[PDB]
Design a protein around this ligand. Structure first.
Ligand code: FES
Ligand code: FES
Ligand code: FES
Ligand code: FES
Ligand code: FES
Ligand code: FES
Ligand code: FES
Ligand code: FES
Ligand code: FES
Ligand code: FES
Lengths: 104, 104, 104, 104, 104, 104, 104, 104, 104, 104
């Protein structure tokens, strides 16, 4: 379904995201090459970090402790930070707005 | 989204499951009360344990290390075991078959 | 409030339990001397283990991962096992039935 | 059960809180939306962070190590900080004063 | 690049394996579907477990502590067990012999 | 049994301390209310932090790794910092001098 | 101060233990050579394992999580098991009855 | 196979690296003595730290959690940081550009 | 430098061992090939497992928590088990008796 | 056996050190009292911190993950920092240069 992604430089792109892939996988499939996924989507790094629009907090599954810990390593973490590889694409995310987190 | 659950007594029932809920939530919502979810779906127990049909293995997100350790506590873990509170409902799961794992 | 406690030997006792203390503290205040609380109610042992009546599962707060891990060390753990030092007494526990878990 | 909450803007409002719910649940239920509870009350984030009036310190259960580590991630932790999803409402909390911690 | 795999039935088949892939990926690409990778090759499960012929032990990088702990959870671990997703394919692996570990 | 405590304001007071109690318990019983024990003396917080006069270091049991990690979370840790709840009162502690560590 | 120790042969000695030492150190200074302290009293093995007489449980400091974990590795652990290097000798232990745990 | 390594002085060498070795071992056999391997390549220090040229990120195996944790201890970590003892040399690394990370 | 090494089959070589090396390193250098060192002596496996003669325990340094943890995974662990890779060769070990632990 | 120890103030004793002892033990036995060994050499503090001369790194055994973790807590840690209690004295250390790390 449709996700609006803002990259680090401010440019915005609408992407069509397949249900059942992770947000990280959808972003990379759409050529958002800047989103390193160094651990390969196994929740062991912070490089798939995105900032989720506050309106959408309720539409995402709860974050885990491991995801929370990894997000804390980043100096750009906010209450709305998520690891994109932890978010499964589904219809309830239709219209999701995310920003790629600044580096580190 | 239609899901076929085998309950502990071996009987099979199809349920509807809203995209974006966890499988555990979809299960309880549809009146499958067998499944305790003692930790309330926060990946801290093994009481939402399901067995997933092999044909669906690759349609689900990778299991996490925390999910994997919780499942090892169960004498009924098989390699198709999942914690259903770790699975987000989405159309790629259309037709999923799960069995409620025996108790313990 | 009122808790019905069965000891290891099968004898049953009604106790009046003060709100805000833990179940372990209430049990010990009532002279259930057999319930060792070796760590002192700091969730680091399994010796305040009780079996909670299934009817009451919904009336207790969710168990944590640490409590869950410690309960797994016990060969007598069941899906309804709780560490009594993790349960805060309050009106919603009125009539709670618990059994002191067998030793280990 | 009557609880006096100071919201982020410094204003004070008394709420009713049902015994057996967590403080975080009592807060949201009474329309205090300020408090995100990203992890959904499973002790895996720091977004339900409250500051408890000192006079009430000893009326609450001991904080856990997992709660303590989560709170250290916040630049606003004080020694009276608690995760409100870790506090069970009960009559001993009658008259509790809490302040919603600033964001981060 | 050429690797001889002994499947669970005991039959032996030679496969080609691209350098830079993991052994797990290579086995899976060559259609050894037997071998589940529940965690997706992120070293958090034990389903990619293979048994490495003793004569190649020297040719493999040191196993890590994390890999070692996951292998101990299997009843079929031997001192030559490896997680195939931890092994990078390179020419020093020419002719490697591995057996698919039994399930669980 | 006699211990000289320097409170946060810098004043010194001698207290009596029963053997077998923890230092934290003794300080609290003698009314040094300054000293919070948020975790209840279960070595899971840093609020019972005291600074031990160098001349008594030898007379105290070795600090544990867990105690060491909790002390590092305080900005006022020194190499003579101890968690007072980890210290058992005994006659070898006669005349022990401790300062209440500053907050946080 | 006086400790009654039952050695592995079932025989028992009353020893004098100096306040401030650990039970492990007291035992060894009294010549109970049975008792290995492989890690040398830093809570990293289970070789200083003793069984505490039920009547004295109350008289010792709370069990730690690390001590609890180490003790679970022993086939001879009971709910009254303690690591003797974790117990500080003091007047409250006067007349303590302990038994050296069988080996393993 | 050919690796272009930039040393801490900013100068750069093309080395030959034998397939199957780690990058750390390759580097050292080529005489890049700058690079300490304090723990000797068992993933327990951060002294074999290198920065991988962005174009090659894809060409390495996934980052592990342990490698991720170690790297965060370094003030010079960037999202392209890798521990060179964790990288197995293979044809897919042909022309790899790496820079030895500053010390610390 | 003299070590009495008893192998799995029962043969008893005496060997010279160079100070500063690990016992595992010594056993391999003297060509005792039985002793796999799967993790390459970075204290992450149990394959360098030996049984030390009781007379010598006190002449080795204290085992670590990590070494103790690895050793407990072995079904042949005894209170005298050591990971040979963790023992630095020195003159105080003159004439040490070790047996190679059975595999697993 | 000869160690060139430089203290915090800059004075440079040379000392004899007995094989089999830890470097910390040696420094204390030669009466270098600066070096607190708060945890009694069980690798749980950072107070036995020394700085090894770069010429000697390769003559010491690999540091452990645990030692590395403790050392990172020190604001004076350098890539040459070692916990002196973790270094077994042996002839290969003949003429080792160490500086006592500044406190904290
Ligand atoms: S890609 Fe590494 S945590 Fe998401
Ligand atoms: S409900 Fe506890 S892990 Fe799913
Ligand atoms: S008393 Fe130890 S866990 Fe409850
Ligand atoms: S809501 Fe996440 S810890 Fe309370
Ligand atoms: S696929 Fe899970 S560990 Fe290899
Ligand atoms: S009171 Fe929490 S650690 Fe001492
Ligand atoms: S001596 Fe090792 S734990 Fe007591
Ligand atoms: S050498 Fe220590 S982590 Fe690479
Ligand atoms: S070689 Fe793996 S622990 Fe000794
Ligand atoms: S003395 Fe504490 S780690 Fe060396």
């Amino acid at each position: 379904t449709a996700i609006l992604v803002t990259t680090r430089d401010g440019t915005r792109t609408e992407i069509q995201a397949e249900p059942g892939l992770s947000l990280m996988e959808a972003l990379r499939d759409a050529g958002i090459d800047e989103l390193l996924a160094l651990c390969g989507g196994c929740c062991s790094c912070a490089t798939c970090h995105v900032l989720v629009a506050p309106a959408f907090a309720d539409r995402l599954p709860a974050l885990s402790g491991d995801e929370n810990d990894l997000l804390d390593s980043s100096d750009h973490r906010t209450p709305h930070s998520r690891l994109s590889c932890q978010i499964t694409i589904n219809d309830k995310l239709e219209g999701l707005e995310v920003e790629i987190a600044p580096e580190d």
